[PDB]
Symmetry: C3
């Protein structure tokens, strides 16, 4: 009696789970919104801005109309390598952006100390990938983490928040190229006998110079001990797999839950109803980057409802113009919605006037949501890269480009108002008194912004 | 000198052979029509109505426009498992429908007794797949089997017929969920020392309670002995394969013969000229279910010509409206043509009036074919699932849904006439005197049929 | 710590490199044009006209609209086998045409003798593939080879030229089915103790009857010795691969260089922006076969500039009508451009009048290029096969058909002028005095050409 080779693992539910972390795939929580949960862990923030800063040169005519295809190829080649290191060292990649990836090792509190050592080693091996031949910066933090899931009956989004999350962004902003920086609390909780550090000026964070373990220390044996605490580390018959999620079996109730996190045009490709290459493109879009700030940004029970309320309104306003929320994440300050007009074959006429009117509408509504202290919105239009970024087993649809960065910097450098770039201003052809011309500011990671404007709106008052 | 790994087995001819049984793939018979052949074997009829009865709930809004994709995923997940069991135990899957799969173990007559034991064990292992967590019913029969191949210069269709075929449907209709039922002759021919059964009331068929072989019996050794008689059981260098058909090599003459059994839109996907996901859909169609009854339905030499004559006319009438024959099979009584208006991008305007006129035309022609005793046609319109159902190595295009079942029950409960449902009647907007409103009947596996009508046609006489 | 299986090698750059030989993939030469380089090697010319001569019967209605799909399937099945033999014996397939494949073993001069023995054995094993059940003819040559790369900022093309190249075509034209023929110089340079030959009448070339090595000779050990001299023979960890090119990693600068050799519609499929089956078709096209002859066709420094000049003009004239250069190769005499109007969804109205006007324009320009002695152009229109021909790891887009052969024979049998077939003449509906009706010639591999015409052009003078 033959025993033929088990082959099939390429179900839609498996393809969907590539787009999500284990935190969500295996999370099994209520469909009520907002949903909040609390845990501890170590976070890793890998800044890949050195990689993503190549978008503008792939618009060069030297790439002969295959810019987007070449871009996605070289980006995924490098990012895949980082992703494998993360996954092999037992982390869960939570999210990708066009500057970073964020990864989590969730553990009970007593194991934080040893897990930090694992993440440090991982960090150093990631830096090792790029030593000779584009580099990265890594910030690490550890401690209490809150997860928030918000959405409606058809879409879901999640975020991690709290001091370990603020910490890992602060850690990462301090870092030079090739640094691994630990947050003060990560430093306080870590195994000091393992690692040699140095002070960072006016900073209680630290930099890791070396991992030098003791005489009898054996990282492989130490790692194996650590895997006792890693719920989903592939093992046994599945020890050849990067993720346990690759083994997911069809389950309609689970798939209904998971699909809500993924954009419809991505699901269409997953269902083999669209060419697998149609979403990689350099296309003109309008970014509407919305930032919400709160009295206290680490208090999920406080900020959860407010974000949910904002989300409900944002989605209804975007729906009108097939605008899309590409991503939500906590910025150094506040909760940010990266909204896009124009991307997977969703490209309206008058994109610009409507983008501005939608931004104003969002601004006016969110301003009156209880507990939202300040709303700020940056609007920028130009050619951006759109595509599925990451590894075959773990990847997300992402938008990368100078205009994306500019919209992000605008909403931070010009808080409390709706701003737009010159392409949006000039292109809207709205009467000029709908705007206020703004003072120029020197903005981190931005050169040659042209003139910036505030969208004042239709009335003087 | 390198010896690189032989990889290529994904030729079009291999993809085509997934759609067909070994009976046809390796059959090498004349292209003359009708063609009849005669043999002996054991049949297995696995009723999967418990699985296919989920179509209506995948039309729920809870599935967010991915009903058809989720449906096909969960259905193939379960059906694949059954298919593997069949294939490993050495059977040939002849056909899939939206209630059943039919499988054949063809052997010389002297081996029927031992092969029945193999099929019984297979049956019990199939029931074991679904014990804890939708179940199936299995009917088995054994004896003489006739094959009929009919068609024209561009299309072919086959059927198995005879008392073993009537037997296996009768066996299967007696079964409760989880039963394995043997036909009287299967019982007469089987190895009674192996199996413990019980009587079934007013039935010479039997139910299998247990397979309890003797002390020294070793199923693996018994199976190996049995494989001596299985012509195409994968073995040797190919013992890792589910089907020998996976090894087929390009052969234009063979491929010309095999392609005639497969629908053109399926061939288009096979040729990588259509997205691999375009044929899975919930779409509105009109089912025209045609049933032909004969004086004696086990006499191939008698019924072959008549079916061929009917086929020639049916195909010419369907051609006019890109109606399609989805399948042909022997129903409990008679030969049935499952015809579909609307499915792989073949969707006409006035689908309904034409479906009715085509049904009448078929009815009038077939009524005058010598040896056709009674023609009955059910016509029903609504949303049905359409898709490729089964395993990667063995699968067929199938239509599943309440309207498909309703058309089937209509043609059986209202013999001798053309009937239609309310959607067809009301939608045709034909004058009401073209119809006769029918008495309501309680029909097996049908609740809440609305009013049913007879299509009387254009004239009183 | 898991060590999961390295999987990914299906990058765009790898798919592109399937279309090119190692000579180009690993060539790393300047982007200046023309570029010339010089080396020594053994050439193998495998005539597959017996395979490609089946195109006309796949247009038969017996193939039911899947002619092109069946054709490409059976052709690639056989050609793949030849390609594997070539690659395993260490050759580089330079180019495919609809009559031949040309393969190169490039080595330092001192190794030519032993490499010829390797190629002879390869040749004999290729003949062995087809012994019992369409055959091939093989010509071999050895000696000095020049490579020419020409093109512009967005397209590149290469050619090998010189006496070893003229030799291998002459060798191949002498061959009967199943022969291996060596050029005089190949014979002069080869290891005579290994091989038994016979004279060929009025020919200093020879035919190989047998490879009979000495008593102690061990081909496997001899081959291993030979691999010392083969730069890219897969080995070590990659000894399971047919080509080292399968291991290429993303590299934007390399990919920009390589893509210029490949047609845009092929790149579109590579980028998963077009169905993988869309380019296999039987479609009507106009072939414009341009032949350029030179005082001395082995002098790259002489013919390089002239070809580059011709290329610049040809491409600008074709651009106007999305005509395409399918291939360039040295014909028995001269450099030939196989140009096509109509193929990957590039099909203009008035294809015919424009094809003739473009041919005349090319003829007039090339006639005045210094060092071009004679220009000849054949124009033929009809249904031709278009498709990707070869092995998964090494394949090219190719056009095959009686009209392709006819255009080729016209330009050789009617030198110095522009000729066209009857479909082109009649179809152009140009006034008849734009043409001259030509004497019929009996042309190698052509029966039933209808009347042929010269395109005289618009004026008497
Ligand atoms: O707020 Se994000 O770290 O998911
Ligand atoms: O009549 Se069917 O069992 O193919
Ligand atoms: O001139 Se061709 O042998 O590439």
């Amino acid at each position: 009696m033959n025993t033929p080779k088990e082959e099939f693992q390429d179900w839609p539910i498996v393809r969907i789970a590539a787009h999500l972390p284990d935190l969500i795939v295996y999370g099994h929580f209520s469909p009520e919104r907002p949903f909040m949960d609390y845990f501890d862990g170590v976070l890793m923030f890998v800044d890949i801005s050195g990689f993503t800063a190549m978008t503008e040169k792939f618009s060069s005519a030297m790439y002969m109309d295959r810019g987007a295809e070449q871009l996605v190829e070289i980006l995924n080649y490098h990012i895949s390598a980082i992703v494998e290191k993360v996954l092999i060292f037992g982390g869960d990649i939570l999210k990708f952006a066009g500057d970073a990836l964020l990864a989590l090792w969730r553990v009970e509190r007593k194991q934080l100390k040893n897990i930090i050592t694992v993440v440090i080693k991982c960090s150093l091996e990631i830096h090792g990938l790029f030593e000779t031949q584009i580099r990265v910066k890594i910030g690490l933090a550890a401690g209490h983490i809150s997860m928030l899931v918000f959405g409606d009956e058809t879409h879901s989004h999640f975020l991690v928040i709290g001091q370990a999350v603020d910490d890992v962004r602060l850690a990462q902003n301090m870092a030079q190229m090739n640094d691994v920086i630990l947050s003060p609390n990560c430093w306080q909780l870590c195994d000091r006998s393992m690692i040699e550090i140095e002070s960072v000026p006016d900073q209680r964070a630290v930099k890791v110079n070396f991992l030098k373990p003791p005489p009898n220390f054996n990282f492989d044996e130490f790692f194996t001990k650590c895997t006792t605490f890693m719920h989903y580390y592939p093992s046994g018959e599945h020890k050849n797999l990067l993720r346990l999620a690759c083994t997911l079996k069809p389950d309609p109730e689970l798939e209904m839950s998971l699909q809500k996190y993924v954009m419809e045009s991505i699901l269409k490709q997953i269902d083999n109803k669209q060419l697998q290459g149609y979403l990689s493109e350099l296309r003109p879009v309008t970014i509407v980057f919305v930032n919400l700030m709160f009295e206290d940004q680490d208090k999920a029970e406080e900020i959860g409802p407010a974000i949910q309320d904002a989300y409900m309104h944002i989605t209804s306003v975007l729906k009108i113009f097939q605008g899309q929320i590409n991503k939500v994440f906590m910025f150094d300050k506040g909760c940010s919605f990266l909204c896009v007009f124009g991307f997977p074959g969703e490209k309206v006429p008058d994109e610009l006037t409507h983008a501005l009117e939608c931004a104003m509408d969002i601004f006016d509504f969110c301003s009156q949501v209880h507990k939202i202290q300040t709303v700020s919105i940056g609007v920028a239009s130009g050619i951006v890269f759109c595509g599925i970024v990451g590894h075959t087993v773990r990847h997300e649809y992402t938008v990368i480009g100078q205009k994306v960065n500019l919209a992000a910097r605008m909403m931070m450098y010009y808080p409390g108002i709706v701003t737009c770039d010159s392409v949006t201003y000039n292109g809207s052809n709205l009467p000029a008194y709908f705007f206020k011309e703004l003072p120029k500011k020197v903005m981190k990671g931005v050169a040659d912004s042209g003139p910036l404007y505030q969208y004042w709106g239709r009335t003087e008052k």
